[PDB]
Design a binder for this molecule. Sequence first.
Ligand SMILES: *[C@@H]1O[C@H](CO)[C@@H](O)[C@H](O)[C@H]1NC(C)=O
Ligand SMILES: *[C@@H]1O[C@H](CO)[C@@H](O)[C@H](O)[C@H]1NC(C)=O
Ligand SMILES: *[C@@H]1O[C@H](CO)[C@@H](O)[C@H](O)[C@H]1NC(C)=O
Ligand SMILES: *[C@@H]1O[C@H](CO)[C@@H](O)[C@H](O)[C@H]1NC(C)=O
Ligand SMILES: *[C@@H]1O[C@H](CO)[C@@H](O)[C@H](O)[C@H]1NC(C)=O
Ligand SMILES: *[C@@H]1O[C@H](CO)[C@@H](O)[C@H](O)[C@H]1NC(C)=O
Ligand SMILES: *[C@@H]1O[C@H](CO)[C@@H](O)[C@H](O)[C@H]1NC(C)=O
Ligand SMILES: *[C@@H]1O[C@H](CO)[C@@H](O)[C@H](O)[C@H]1NC(C)=O
Ligand SMILES: *[C@@H]1O[C@H](CO)[C@@H](O)[C@H](O)[C@H]1NC(C)=O
Ligand SMILES: *[C@@H]1O[C@H](CO)[C@@H](O)[C@H](O)[C@H]1NC(C)=O
Ligand SMILES: *[C@@H]1O[C@H](CO)[C@@H](O)[C@H](O)[C@H]1NC(C)=O
Ligand SMILES: *[C@@H]1O[C@H](CO)[C@@H](O)[C@H](O)[C@H]1NC(C)=O
Ligand SMILES: *[C@@H]1O[C@H](CO)[C@@H](O)[C@H](O)[C@H]1NC(C)=O
Ligand SMILES: *[C@@H]1O[C@H](CO)[C@@H](O)[C@H](O)[C@H]1NC(C)=O
Ligand SMILES: [Ca+2]
Ligand SMILES: [Ca+2]
Lengths: 578, 578
Amino acid sequence: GPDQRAQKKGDIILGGLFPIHFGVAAKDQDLKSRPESVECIRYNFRGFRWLQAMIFAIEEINSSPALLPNLTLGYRIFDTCNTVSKALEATLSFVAQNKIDSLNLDEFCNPSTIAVVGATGSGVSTAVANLLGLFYIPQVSYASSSRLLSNKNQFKSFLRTIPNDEHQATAMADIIEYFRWNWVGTIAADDDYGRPGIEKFREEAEERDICIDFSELISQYSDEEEIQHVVEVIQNSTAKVIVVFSSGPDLEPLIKEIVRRNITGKIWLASEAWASSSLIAMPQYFHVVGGTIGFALKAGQIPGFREFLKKVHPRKSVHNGFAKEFWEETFNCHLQEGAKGPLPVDTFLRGHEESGDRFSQSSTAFRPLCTGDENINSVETPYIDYTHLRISYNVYLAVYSIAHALQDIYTCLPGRGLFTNGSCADIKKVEAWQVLKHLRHLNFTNNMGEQVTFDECGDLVGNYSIINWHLSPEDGSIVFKEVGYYNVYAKKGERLFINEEKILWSGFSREVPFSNCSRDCLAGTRKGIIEGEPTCCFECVECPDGEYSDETDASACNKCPDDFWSNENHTSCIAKEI
Amino acid sequence: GPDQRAQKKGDIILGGLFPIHFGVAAKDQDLKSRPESVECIRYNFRGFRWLQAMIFAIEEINSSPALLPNLTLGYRIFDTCNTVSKALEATLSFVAQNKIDSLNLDEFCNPSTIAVVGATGSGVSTAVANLLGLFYIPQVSYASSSRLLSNKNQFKSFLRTIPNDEHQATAMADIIEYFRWNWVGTIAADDDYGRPGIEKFREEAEERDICIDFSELISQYSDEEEIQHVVEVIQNSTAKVIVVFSSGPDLEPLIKEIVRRNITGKIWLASEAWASSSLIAMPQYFHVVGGTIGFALKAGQIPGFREFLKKVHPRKSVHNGFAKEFWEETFNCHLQEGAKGPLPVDTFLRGHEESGDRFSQSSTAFRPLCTGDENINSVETPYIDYTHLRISYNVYLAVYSIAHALQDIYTCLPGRGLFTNGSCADIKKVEAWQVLKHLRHLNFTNNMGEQVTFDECGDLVGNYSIINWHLSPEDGSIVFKEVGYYNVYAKKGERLFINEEKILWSGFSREVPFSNCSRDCLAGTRKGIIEGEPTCCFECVECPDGEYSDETDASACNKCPDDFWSNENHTSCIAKEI
Ligand SMILES: *[C@@H]1O[C@H](CO)[C@@H](O)[C@H](O)[C@H]1NC(C)=O
Ligand SMILES: *[C@@H]1O[C@H](CO)[C@@H](O)[C@H](O)[C@H]1NC(C)=O
Ligand SMILES: *[C@@H]1O[C@H](CO)[C@@H](O)[C@H](O)[C@H]1NC(C)=O
Ligand SMILES: *[C@@H]1O[C@H](CO)[C@@H](O)[C@H](O)[C@H]1NC(C)=O
Ligand SMILES: *[C@@H]1O[C@H](CO)[C@@H](O)[C@H](O)[C@H]1NC(C)=O
Ligand SMILES: *[C@@H]1O[C@H](CO)[C@@H](O)[C@H](O)[C@H]1NC(C)=O
Ligand SMILES: *[C@@H]1O[C@H](CO)[C@@H](O)[C@H](O)[C@H]1NC(C)=O
Ligand SMILES: *[C@@H]1O[C@H](CO)[C@@H](O)[C@H](O)[C@H]1NC(C)=O
Ligand SMILES: *[C@@H]1O[C@H](CO)[C@@H](O)[C@H](O)[C@H]1NC(C)=O
Ligand SMILES: *[C@@H]1O[C@H](CO)[C@@H](O)[C@H](O)[C@H]1NC(C)=O
Ligand SMILES: *[C@@H]1O[C@H](CO)[C@@H](O)[C@H](O)[C@H]1NC(C)=O
Ligand SMILES: *[C@@H]1O[C@H](CO)[C@@H](O)[C@H](O)[C@H]1NC(C)=O
Ligand SMILES: *[C@@H]1O[C@H](CO)[C@@H](O)[C@H](O)[C@H]1NC(C)=O
Ligand SMILES: *[C@@H]1O[C@H](CO)[C@@H](O)[C@H](O)[C@H]1NC(C)=O
Ligand SMILES: [Ca+2]
Ligand SMILES: [Ca+2]
């Protein structure tokens, strides 16, 4: 398929899809001549690291004698540029051999892909899944978390090492329940993410008897006026706990304004989409957004990866086409055409110093020089300058899923096969649909000792890492301290586990905040219903003359003995002086 | 003047001019509206280092109690962008106060610059000098080496810590003389550099009895045909020694072709313009260009400079306007608007990962993020990745020239002043023309222990460092090993001093090559003139019958005694058997 790729031979081929670029250029095709392939514009260092996580896991699988012995895992990895078009150009190459000809007569004419890792965006994954589904080629996504992809009617071969965004709303309710709060506020992104998330939360909240004071919608494109309203809505409210179902871009305008007005009290309940978002996790914002409790993807650990990442070289990395471009973008240089060794960067450019130079002639020619001798462990790029592996880990975990599903094919005995009936699959003549069947019944142990099995819908039955926003003493930046986990496999109530001692409320407090509508009614008063306000909002109605309320949180005052009467402050009855 | 600059207050102001950019953008001004200032395009890390050499020397002058005590040296440094226009915008600001008003009535209306450091290109310096000359403001250039600037009729206030390109041609002849060679070839750039250089060399060569076999002209814009001819001209010639008066760009096409044809023998005599040129000093080329002997600017040593260079910060460097742009270009990031601390580079860009993203909207917005916490000692840029200080040293040496000329003003006693007669100059009321007078009579000792005094024409009476092209064993690149010096102050013959032991001919030979037209005539033969060929091309004519040649290099054969006759091989006469 596409010219630029990361390809290596093997007995079984694995397809990769990664956003090495954030998008494609806005070229208006003249159509005056045969249109040429659009060019990808913003370099993604993180995306290239995700691509390396696939290669590394394959190389680790091939080195390990235990896993897939007498087999070589081969790969064909392309750049999606976060666009459906580029991602489909790649998918067509994966799909090409498999059944395209099987449907058509072209078989009379003339490298089968059995599984595909990817993609990042839920939009891109949907487009890829529509094509891979026709031939039942399994697709294991590392970052697409939209609830729409769970539909096994539409997506026949879709799987993901990332959990569905639905469970997050039920999880939020479980935390409100745990810290015994009944007065909350909701903020949502005015999109297919925030809206159903807050709606699902609203359903779960009313079930656990949690009342919502306010429900507001936000966007990245909201007016100064639209933001001013929500800010007032939060300020006017007595609820400290706010549940936010937004992304970093959509929530950023509102947060900027709350940081502008220095509104400290609020204790944030972060949605996965912004819980680890560095757009919000900014040190200038800690006054407001400090001590935020959120959901993250488990920060996995891949040993020897940092070393393998450092091993990249444009000449030495023969199976990585993107290695030259990476080198070129990480140093901002037009790499030397021919040979080593070290030479200054100016080399060509110093030609501009000449008094016989250009008038827009050599400016388009003379570019910074790369020898290939530069050290990458030096430069500050998201490639090596990273704190946690979450997506890189899901790319890792994605490859292993396919390897273990293939190992299950290799392992089964002729009477214990899944296929009709007891029939095992030939690993030499292995088909994509067979790997899909094995991936559905897959149960394997992670390289971190965690059980990795898939749901009916193809989602990873996995944990959400409960993280807390602390400020580093040494560093001076926001730190995501893991204070718990959310197991979606466990039964209702047994799904959540948090270590309160590890939490720092608002970023400094060590005592769990109060976020109930009305403070508990004392002795001398009873609970009174407030008209208009919800069930959890009560009035502390003083006991009538001749009645007393013994304990706190009393529904009604008790009448006193015929001979006795209420004391002055209605705590208990006293004897009538006769 | 211009908005962006490096400015600091002081008792006396020094003007700086540096190419922080290689040029300006090719904008065709619509003229449909008031044209806006053209933008500078290619970032020059080396140029910014040269700018730092000025600041560092000023800061070192201010810290040292010996030099200019009770005075603060102030500066106003601008970016020339290697263009006359940008360099003139700056110069106008320097010139502004001084006499512009003095000529005109505007004095009735409302920071004097006494000396200017710069510029790089001979073209730019000429344009600056034409303006500074009207007000006699001294200009000390660090890189402009054109012979045209020596004209004190045109350039009244021009000086330079770089020597004039003229002496180089006489120096070349002195080397040919030293290694006792008479058969050479010449190659020149078809411009105002190569042409007069080779012509001046041709004059000096004929004086020391050096014959030139071929004289060819080259360009960076020469045809494949034009280069093929010169290559043949060199190949067909018997001369090993070739004298090249070219720049790296102009000589590069010819060198590429000589490297293509693997012509090893040739021993190159490099002109300053290409002697240290990394465009030619490439390891792939060593087969041809190995052991090149050339002229360099003395590789000076500035202690504590590397430390000061590392001290740069966009926030912390308050007097350096270019510090933010440097930071931005050395990391390729749009620096954070407000505050610290460390944050990932993606931050904004990771917003492209969202499924509700742009169509050429956020692509123009989302840019890589800089915290200001990044380490510069890491990144491979010509700013810190440098081997020798030649131009940076001339910028250093330029500032010191002005400081010592000012110290001479401060030091003189009321009867020993240069001015009419014995009159000293008031340092509190110091004028630019007074500093110029002191710079002309300047004699001071360098921070390396070298005498720094200026010629009548304003050139630095300084050495040319004789360097040799060796290949590094550890590194694997071209090394410029200093094998001598060329003192232009010394008298004819006593100007040159080279250490033959330090030289490696062709890059490996330890024996001085043969580059004479004809090999010395032996015993039995005499020297015979070849018609058409020059004086140094001789024929070894065998002695006639009855004549003998006793020793080697004989002008004619001697007749034998009347009784005796020539021996068979004419070495000496033998007795006639009677
Ligand atoms: C808030 O209300 C809940 C109701 O379930 C209760 O458990 C909690 O203790 C209340 N908070 C206080 C401080 O009384
Ligand atoms: C409270 O909210 C209303 C709208 O819901 C708004 O008009 C008002 O300004 C807010 N704040 C105060 C101080 O009343
Ligand atoms: C919050 O905002 C005000 C605005 O004037 C500012 O002065 C104050 O320093 C801020 N609070 C803190 C603790 O930064
Ligand atoms: C294979 O097993 C399935 C599941 O029990 C059943 O539907 C099918 O009829 C069996 N086939 C045979 C050959 O018995
Ligand atoms: C297999 O899957 C079942 C059901 O999810 C689970 O109980 C079991 O622990 C998994 N692993 C093993 C080793 O049985
Ligand atoms: C979640 O945590 C439990 C307990 O540590 C573990 O068994 C499970 O496998 C983890 N989930 C994932 C995604 O591996
Ligand atoms: C009731 O009144 C007495 C006497 O003033 C006082 O000491 C007590 O605190 C009051 N309240 C309660 C809750 O007993
Ligand atoms: C080359 O000619 C010069 C003439 O001055 C002479 O000194 C030198 O020795 C000659 N070379 C040889 C090898 O004879
Ligand atoms: C020598 O030079 C002439 C032109 O000067 C050229 O025609 C010829 O090809 C060159 N080489 C040989 C091998 O004669
Ligand atoms: C010079 O050129 C030839 C061209 O075929 C090449 O094979 C040879 O290796 C070169 N010489 C050296 C020593 O590199
Ligand atoms: C000052 O000295 C110069 C040089 O000797 C001379 O031309 C000039 O006339 C002298 N002036 C006086 C006042 O004697
Ligand atoms: C001053 O200049 C003269 C002439 O160039 C020179 O001989 C002398 O050494 C210089 N320095 C001193 C300290 O006299
Ligand atoms: C040249 O070298 C001599 C001897 O080391 C020294 O006196 C002279 O000052 C040097 N030239 C320069 C440019 O300083
Ligand atoms: C002269 O001839 C003799 C006898 O053949 C020989 O030994 C000698 O080398 C010849 N040449 C010279 C330079 O003497
Ligand atoms: Ca993707
Ligand atoms: Ca300049």
